[PDB]
Amino acid sequence: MYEGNNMRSMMGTSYEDSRLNKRTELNENMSIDTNKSEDSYGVQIHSLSKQSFTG
Amino acid sequence: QSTKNETALLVAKSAKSALQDFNHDYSKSWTFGDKWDNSNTMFETFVNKYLFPKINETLLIDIALGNRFNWLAKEQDFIGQYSEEYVIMDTVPINMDLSKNEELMLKRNYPRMATKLYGNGIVKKQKFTLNNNDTRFNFQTLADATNYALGVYKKKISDINVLEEKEMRAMLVDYSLNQLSETNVRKATSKEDLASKVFEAILNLQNNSAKYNEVHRASGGAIGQYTTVSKLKDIVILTTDSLKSYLLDTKIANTFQIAGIDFTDHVISFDDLGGVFKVTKEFKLQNQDSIDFLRAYGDYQSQLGDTIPVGAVFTYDVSKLKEFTGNVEEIKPKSDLYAFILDINSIKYKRYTKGMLKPPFHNPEFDEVTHWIHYYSFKAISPFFNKILITDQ
Amino acid sequence: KNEELMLKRNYPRMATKLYGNGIVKKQKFTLNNNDTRFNFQTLADATNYAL
Questions:
Q1: Which residue of B50, B201, B241, C9 pairs with B388 in a disulfide if CB–CB is 3.0 to 4.6 A?
Q2: Are B300 and C8 in contact (CB < 8 Å)?
Q3: Which of B245, B264, B354 to mutate: most A Cβ within 10 Å?
Q4: How far is A44 from chain B (nearest CA, A)?
Q5: Would the CB atoms of C9 and B152 count as touching at under 8 Å?
């Protein structure tokens, strides 16, 4: 409530939100597409996308 | 056995390695090289048997490692430390015995209360350190070094997810064992028995029971009863993955009317329900290899002589250390036959990750960049809801 | 703990495995133009043989 000048370099600006970023994820999905043995009644074994992890 | 091959002797002479040129305050400053042979090694080509071999690529295999919980993640705003909630206990009504004198209507009856005071969470921290001197002696291109620095950051934001996942399942298995006193355990007898006993226990959630909850260790709810039901949009059951595999290949397969009776949407599971450990007896650190083993997992800050309080966890296999046997106990089910059922909004998970990354610290006098990660997690079990364990006890 | 703990170095650990070379593989075949003509009744089936 008291103003003064709340903006100083750090810890005058840290007690507010302070740059919400990099949320801990379920962006790649778990327990839904993963942990899923609920696959369709298939027709053949067609292919599996070989991914080359490069970085 | 040994080897009289001269280039094997060259590899074995580690005195000329680059490692000796950083442990010491002075060194050689010129190199005369050496005649490198490839013959009688694992490094021959047919034509040119005198070249040092070549590496063509690296690829930096990385996996992203989710949480399986963070719809539980609500966000408080990092103020205060004590939070609590409370209920009113039941009062069964009484008959009208009019023979009693009329002035008791002046006498009072306050309602009764059971609270549960929780307290603070805990803040998790980890460091990592990008060098500019030793680490670039590898990485034949700079692009591999940039992918390296990116991938170490991505996996050090995945490990926090797998960490809080395994310690959540640690906390509620620990609550399943050391709490949840006498009624709500149910002894199964086989891997198919508790498959029936779970939806025996389902539909016991939804009768008005003064049992099935954990009021009897609240503040004022030591003596008295308290009734609560569930809704079936809210129940969460958990178990070993082998149990739900036995479910999904046996009962919903070999039966014939599974249009409505399939509770499998509320089944979360795990591979094994223990890799976690609990302190007893409040030891200290004495031996060198113990903290060296701690260095293998990121625990740098502990030294010899540092105590360990009784309420801590260790989250990986650490009990095989000679200084922990008898002091450290694994939170695990007893018999690989486990089904702990509850309702959601009985667990409280609440973290603060707003100021998560910190600014990097540059150390010029050894030329590194150090990053920290901080986040304030809190988790507990509210004891005011219906829960049933099923094991072999 | 002590406040000078922040200038301690925490290097990341990696785990490697190396791989050798592969194998180059080779096969050869030789066609003829003079006596091969003695075993066909057209030029078309000889070209079918060659393909």
A1: B201
A2: yes
A3: B354
A4: 21
A5: no
Nearest to A22 by CA among B120, B358, B41: B358
B345 CB-contact burial (10 Å; exposed 0-12 / middle 13-18 / buried 19+):
middle
Q: Tell me which residue has tokens 């053949």.
A: A44
3-class secondary structure, B51: coil
User: Which residues have CB under 8 Å from B215's CB, separation 6+?
Assistant: B87, B89, B114, B221, B224, B225, B226, B383, B384
Q: B334, B349, B312, B327: which is closest to B173 by C-alpha?
A: B334
Closest-CA residue of B relative to C8 is: B300
Q: Is B269 helix (H, G, I), strand (E, B) or coil?
A: strand
Which residues from chain B sit within 8 angstroms of residue C5, using beta carbons? 301
Q: Are B277 and B315 in contact (CB under 8 A)?
A: yes
Count CB neighbours of A26 within 10 A. Answer: 17
Asked if the C-beta of A26 comes within 8 angstroms of chain B's C-beta atoms, the answer is yes
Which chain A residues are Cβ-neighbours of B145 within 8 angstroms?
none
Round to whole Å and give the CA distance between B319 and B289. 13
- Whether residues A53 and B60 touch (CB distance < 8 A) is answered with yes
Tell me if A52 and B354 make a contact (CB, 8 A cut-off).
no
Distance from CA of C12 to the nearest CA of B (A): 7
Cβ–Cβ under 8 Å, residues B175 and B380: no
B273-311 burial by CB neighbour count: b if 16+ within 10 A, else e? bbbbbbbeeeeebeeeebbebbeeebebeeeeeeebeee
Q: Can you read off the two tokens belonging to residue B86?
A: 């409370």
Locus of tokens 């490839």: B38
Q: What residues contact B286, with CB distance under 8 A and at least 6 apart?
A: B304, B305, B323
> Per the structure block, which two tokens stand in for C5?
């703990």
CA–CA separation, B387 and B344 (whole Å): 10
**DSSP labels for B354-370?**
TT-B---EEETTTTEEE
The closest of A42, C47, A52, A20 to B59, measured between CA atoms, is: A52
Please tell me the experimental approach by which this structure was elucidated: cryo-EM
Taking the Cβ of residue A32 and every Cβ of chain B, the question of whether any pair is shorter than 8 Å is answered with no
With an 8 Å Cβ cutoff, is C12 touching chain B?
A: yes
